Design a protein around this nucleic acid. Structure first.
Lengths: 244, 223, 215, 299, 251
RNA sequence: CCCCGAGAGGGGGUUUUUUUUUUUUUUUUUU
């Protein structure tokens, strides 16, 4: 029971968007050159994410070294000031966070060509400065951008998106208010394809609605891929112009 | 002393068993000899990794004591010098307490000793001898010594005892007393009366164990 | 609660009670802990506050982590039985103490070795019917005694003093300073504090030498 | 401690899949036969899937609810691994990738989903309540831990019975089972997990840019099949035709329609499993009542 | 607007396997066919909104087959719609001597759902198999399609039984239902059923004058006990079944 | 398979300890 107009009869949402529109998606490449080999600053809505890629480099412990592939590590730092109400405890060892880190690794292990970087380590540090729904999808986009900036080989883009289901209606790119009022589905889409790297459903969804929700997410993720690709060619082109 | 045991029930372990006395049911597994961690390595002998899991909740300091006493029994039983710089993992998962765990850990310890021994036998690890463990209790109004007491008997007990003996020569010669864990109020006369009756029931247990071991293992071997 | 300790029932609540210049003297003892290489007992009683702390030096022992031409030193303060301090505050004093003894300990004589110094704030009674500043000079005294008792080479007997929240440790007959600490206090009182602390430094150094020799 | 897998074994098991063969002789869409055994005490349940052996124990004790939730009781699920299931598992390793995933799947399937009526665990609001605990013990591992645990937890919760409590004022009166019978728990729905394993018969290039999809997906993989897969999918449903949770945490990129097919295939399995659990619970109740009649008669 | 597009000319499909009918209603295959049964409705004189319909046959094994058929309103009102919304809001239709404020539209409650005679109507049916002592051997619930033989009145139904005039299969079934009801009522009384009373007066209205002039009293006929006993039997069996299926959200 | 001498010499292919769990807004039946 929600007293707010999550989806008005006029087809408008609480923030003004319609059913099908992505939130301001502003990417940023090479934000921390003196701190990492690759870096990206993501702004998807009110979400603010710093992503640092450090590597490939020498492992700090020879015990943890693979002679056939690189070691991929991801640590997500959800700051205590990410949400309106400051969290008293840290989230560093939170099971929810360990699953997120694990999830992200399992995603890019099959995309990043770790096999061509044996006896090395790729460390991915993430700092979530502000959170407002769809943080998982934003985490995916931040890593993909930062990895590319580091010149680390990968097969394709991985775009992340979230889709809510309020009653019958499907809502693209939901915020914190919408996620609190309905079940959401987080989708990671490889490139322009229909193949999902990540399918995440944590709340109840009717079996009949799931296929349609996936269809919305994939279409929306393709737009995220285009925006990421666009901003990347723009950054590339300028560098090429100035360097050459 | 109507215990029941099964041998070789687990697939991904070198050896396993399931010992049941009364309501106390413990399943044990043994892997070894295998490659040890650097901090576990012993230059000349075998290293024992002993783990005890409770029937309810997670492992606390209580089970840490069960691991320690179980170590005192299993250590001299195994011919450790046969496996230098090597490891033997021994895990006990207590499935059913068979007693008020908030007050006693008697039956769980004895059942873990018997199960661990059986698992070591199944795994084919060098043992210097055989072993059997029984729980014993005493009642103040009764003045009696009850071997293998029930949970209800423990509630009205004045002392609780764990006795584990080391047997040789076809389970007829008590080589040594591996563990005697006496807790509560008791006198010297009660102690030796306990040890006399305890040795009898222990010897009966070994005989029963020897039967169980042969019944299970012989079909695997060839004539 | 905790699976490694016995902390009792959770519904239990701790017992809370209700209501219905000055000269300083200290006692010194060394080498009473066979477990380690060097140890010291420092007890001080003055006005409405007495302190009994124990120091223990473990080293030089093996270092796994890295090769070293010189030695490596670590200092850890532990809370005692009743009085308690913030872990942050104990870490801060530890860092302050590390800087001091990295100027005194002849590290060159201990390649690829570790000298781990423990200071137990065993009994700190507050009888007044940042208090950590008054304990600092006694820590330095204990660590100096323990290191000397351990046989660890020292450039000079490091001692200290406290005056109005200001703590300063001296060496070389008070000519130079190996550490400066200041909390609260007043303004433009640096010169007065230096003199008062040097007096305590001199007194502590004499008693320390007297302890290392006669005992 | 690693499990060494030869190139020959890797090539063989994968090639067998290309020929519609799996070693145990099952079908790509075939779920293992689930055997459920109840102990003497309520909340004691043993689940067996082929060689996979898991045991769950439900327990409860009087406790005080959180300040935030004065009307709700406490409920926790423990799934600590041990070397008993295999030396591959470190004792107490509760931060490993697979461990945290499994822990999170079960939590989102039972805890978060509200399978258990925590509101009915309250005795006196903001003061005293029941604290239900589900302890899963992994005895023997041959894959399908997530599916085995979800069944073990649910079968246990539905089999468990808590002792009657009468409350006056501050005082709590815990009635023993013999004096009065114990009370069952409140189950809002019955979540069942079905895990799919994915295999790429070709190379990564044909998975990313390949026209025709050829990735193989099997239901409820054994240990050997689990160690050679390229992606995992765990989908949880109930008889009410609703998805409780879906988790494809990375791995081999898979076609969306194929993932939907898996969800529909899993629904047919969870239906058979749920009905199976209910039947074994009825017979267990009939067994305990028949013995109660034979105990009173002779008595 | 949530009402069927057909209107008053809506009709249950002749064949329950017809391609067109199955295409529109894929659940029609689950619909049982009880249009061969002898269904009749016993309601007050001016009753147009018929909810319940009864029938009775004698099985060859000596036992009786009793079927209570209730209007299939669910097939027309669907959750989420404004029709369902208003239906939940009103909760129930109020009954006055003057008017009658319906919970559902006239087109639905007086016709499409109403188990009128001589027409094929969708219904949720509950069929029992019970002995002569009215003891339930088994019970089955099923959505069906029926056709009411005749819509009797309480006075009209009682007279048909009373006369002995008709040997027709329908009347023979009506008598059987009465026999079961007495057995069923008696069991309830033995069990501990209550017998409270509050027979309120009925405001007679003269045909000649709109203003009311006469106040009489409604008399309980044996047909009232006939319907009451089988309505209770239907509600009980359904209650047991829905609670067995949904132990946590059973209405 | 790899680096250094012009011809069966030589040098390399990469092993081991440290620090606990929560988590977002006036009964009954037909009317």
């Amino acid at each position: 029971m929600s007293r707010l107009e999550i989806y008005s009869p006029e087809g408008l949402r609480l923030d003004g968007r319609r059913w099908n529109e992505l939130r301001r998606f502003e990417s940023s490449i090479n934000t921390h050159p003196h701190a990492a080999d690759g870096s990206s600053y993501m702004e998807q809505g009110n979400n603010k994410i710093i992503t640092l890629v450090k590597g490939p480099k020498e492992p700090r412990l020879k015990s943890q070294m693979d002679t056939s592939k690189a070691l991929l590590n991801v640590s997500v730092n959800i700051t205590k000031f990410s949400k309106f109400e400051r969290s008293k405890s840290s989230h560093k060892n939170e099971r929810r966070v360990l699953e997120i880190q694990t999830s992200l690794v399992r995603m890019f292990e099959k995309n990043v060509m770790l096999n061509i970087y044996p006896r090395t380590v790729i460390d991915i540090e993430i700092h979530v400065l502000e959170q407002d729904g769809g943080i998982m999808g934003s985490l995916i986009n931040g890593i993909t951008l930062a990895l590319i900036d580091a010149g680390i080989s990968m097969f394709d883009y991985i775009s992340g998106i979230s889709v809510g289901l309020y009653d019958t209606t499907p809502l693209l790119d939901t915020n914190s208010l919408e996620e609190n009022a309905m079940s959401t589905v987080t989708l990671g889409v490889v490139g322009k394809s229909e193949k999902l790297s990540l399918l995440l459903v944590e709340d109840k969804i009717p079996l009949d609605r799931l296929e349609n929700v996936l269809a919305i997410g994939i279409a929306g993720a393709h737009r995220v891929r285009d925006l990421m690709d666009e901003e990347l060619r723009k950054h590339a082109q300028k560098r090429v112009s100035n360097a050459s | 002393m109507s215990v029941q045991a099964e041998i070789g029930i687990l697939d991904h372990v070198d050896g396993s068993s399931e010992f049941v006395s009364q309501d106390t049911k413990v399943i044990c597994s043994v892997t070894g000899p295998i490659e040890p961690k650097a901090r576990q390595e012993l230059p000349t002998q075998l290293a024992l990794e002993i783990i005890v899991r409770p029937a309810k909740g997670v492992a606390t300091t209580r089970e840490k004591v069960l691991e320690d006493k179980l170590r005192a029994v299993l250590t001299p039983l195994i011919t450790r010098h046969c496996y230098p710089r090597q490891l033997c993992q021994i895990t006990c998962q207590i499935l059913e307490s068979g007693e008020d765990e908030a007050e006693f850990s008697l039956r769980e310890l004895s059942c873990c000793i018997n199960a661990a021994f059986l698992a070591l036998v199944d795994a084919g690890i060098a043992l210097n001898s055989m072993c059997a463990s029984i729980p014993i209790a005493i009642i103040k109004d009764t003045s009696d010594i009850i071997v293998d007491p029930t949970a209800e008997q423990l509630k009205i007990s004045l002392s609780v005892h764990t006795l584990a003996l080391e047997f040789v020569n076809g389970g007829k010669v008590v080589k040594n007393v591996l563990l005697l864990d006496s807790n509560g109020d008791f006198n010297e006369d009660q102690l030796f009366s306990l040890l006399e009756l305890g040795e009898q029931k222990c010897q009966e247990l070994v005989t029963n164990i020897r039967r169980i071991i042969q019944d299970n293992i012989s079909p695997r071997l060839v004539v | 609660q905790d699976r490694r300790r016995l902390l009792g029932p959770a519904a239990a609540k701790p017992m809370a009670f209700s209501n219905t210049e000055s000269e300083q003297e200290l006692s010194l003892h060394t080498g009473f802990i066979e477990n380690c290489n060097g140890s010291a007992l420092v007890e001080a009683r003055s006005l409405g506050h007495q302190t009994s702390l124990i120091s223990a030096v473990y080293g030089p022992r093996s270092i796994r982590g890295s090769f070293t031409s010189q030695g490596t030193i670590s200092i850890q303060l532990k809370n005692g039985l009743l009085e308690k301090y913030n872990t942050n505050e104990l870490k801060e004093v530890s860092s302050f103490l590390m800087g001091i003894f990295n100027s005194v300990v002849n590290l060159s004589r201990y390649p690829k070795s570790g000298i781990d110094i423990f200071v137990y704030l065993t009994y700190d009674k507050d009888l007044t019917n940042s208090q950590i500043s008054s304990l600092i000079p006694h820590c330095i005294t204990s660590i100096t005694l323990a290191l000397a008792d351990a046989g660890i080479e020292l450039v000079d007997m490091a001692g200290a003093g406290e005056a109005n929240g200001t703590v300063v440790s001296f060496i070389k007959n008070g000519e130079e300073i190996v550490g400066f600490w200041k909390d609260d206090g007043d303004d433009e009182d640096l010169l007065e504090c230096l003199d008062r602390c040097k007096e305590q430094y001199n007194r502590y150094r004499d008693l320390m030498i007297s302890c290392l020799m006669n005992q | 401690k690693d499990i060494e897998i030869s190139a020959s074994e890797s090539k063989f098991i994968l090639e067998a899949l290309r020929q519609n063969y799996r070693l145990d002789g099952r079908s790509f869409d075939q779920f293992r036969d689930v055997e459920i055994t109840f102990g003497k005490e309520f909340g004691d349940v043993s689940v067996k899937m082929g060689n996979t052996k898991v045991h769950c124990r439900i327990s409860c004790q009087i406790a005080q609810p959180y300040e935030d939730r004065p009307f709700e009781g406490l409920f926790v699920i423990s799934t600590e691994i041990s070397p008993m299931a295999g030396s591959q598992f470190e004792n107490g390793n509760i931060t490993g990738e697979d461990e945290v995933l499994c822990s999170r799947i079960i939590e989102k399937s039972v805890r978060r989903s509200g399978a258990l009526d925590v509101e009915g665990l309250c005795i006196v609001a903001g003061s005293k309540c029941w604290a239900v605990r589900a302890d899963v013990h992994f005895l023997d591992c041959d894959g399908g831990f997530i599916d085995a645990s979800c069944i073990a937890v649910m079968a246990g919760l539905m089999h468990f019975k808590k002792p009657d409590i009468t409350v006056h004022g501050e005082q709590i009166i815990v009635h023993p089972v013999n004096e009065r019978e114990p009370v069952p728990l409140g189950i809002l729905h019955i979540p069942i997990c079905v895990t799919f394993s994915f295999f790429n018969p070709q190379d990564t290039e044909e998975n990313i840019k390949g026209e025709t999809n050829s990735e193989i997906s099997i239901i409820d993989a054994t240990l050997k099949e689990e160690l050679l897969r390229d992606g995992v999918l765990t989908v949880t449903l109930n008889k009410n035709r609703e998805v409780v949770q879906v988790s494809k945490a990375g791995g081999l990129p898979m076609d969306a329609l194929t993932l939907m097919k898996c969800c529909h295939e899993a629904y047919s399995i969870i239906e058979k499993i749920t009905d199976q659990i209910l039947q074994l619970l009825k017979e267990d109740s009939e067994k305990r009542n028949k013995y109660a009649a034979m105990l009173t008669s002779e008595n | 607007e949530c009402l069927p597009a057909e209107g008053h000319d809506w009709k249950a499909p002749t064949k329950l396997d017809d391609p067109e009918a199955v295409s529109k209603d894929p659940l029609l295959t689950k619909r049982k066919d009880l249009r061969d049964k002898l269904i009749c409705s016993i309601d007050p004189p001016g009753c147009v909104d018929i909810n319940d319909a009864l029938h009775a046959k004698k099985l060859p094994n000596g036992n009786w087959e009793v079927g209570v058929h209730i209007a299939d309103v669910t097939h027309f009102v669907k959750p989420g719609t404004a029709l369902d919304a208003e239906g939940a809001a009103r909760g129930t239709s109020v009954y006055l001597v003057d008017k009658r404020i319906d919970m559902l539209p006239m087109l639905l409650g007086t016709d499409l759902c109403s188990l009128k005679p001589y027409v094929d109507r969708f219904a949720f049916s509950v069929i029992w198999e019970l002995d002569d002592s009215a003891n339930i051997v088994n019970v089955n619930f099923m959505k069906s399609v029926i056709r009411s033989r005749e819509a009797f009145s309480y006075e009209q139904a009682q007279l048909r039984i009373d006369d002995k005039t008709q040997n027709d299969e329908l009347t023979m079934g009506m008598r059987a239902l009465l026999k079961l009801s007495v057995k069923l009522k008696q069991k309830r009384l033995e069990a501990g059923a209550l017998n409270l009373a509050s027979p309120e007066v009925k405001v007679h209205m003269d045909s000649e004058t709109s203003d009311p002039n006469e106040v009489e009293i409604k008399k309980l006929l044996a047909t009232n006990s006939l319907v009451e006993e089988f309505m209770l039997l239907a509600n009980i069996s359904v209650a047991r079944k829905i609670y067995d299926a949904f132990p946590q959200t059973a209405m």
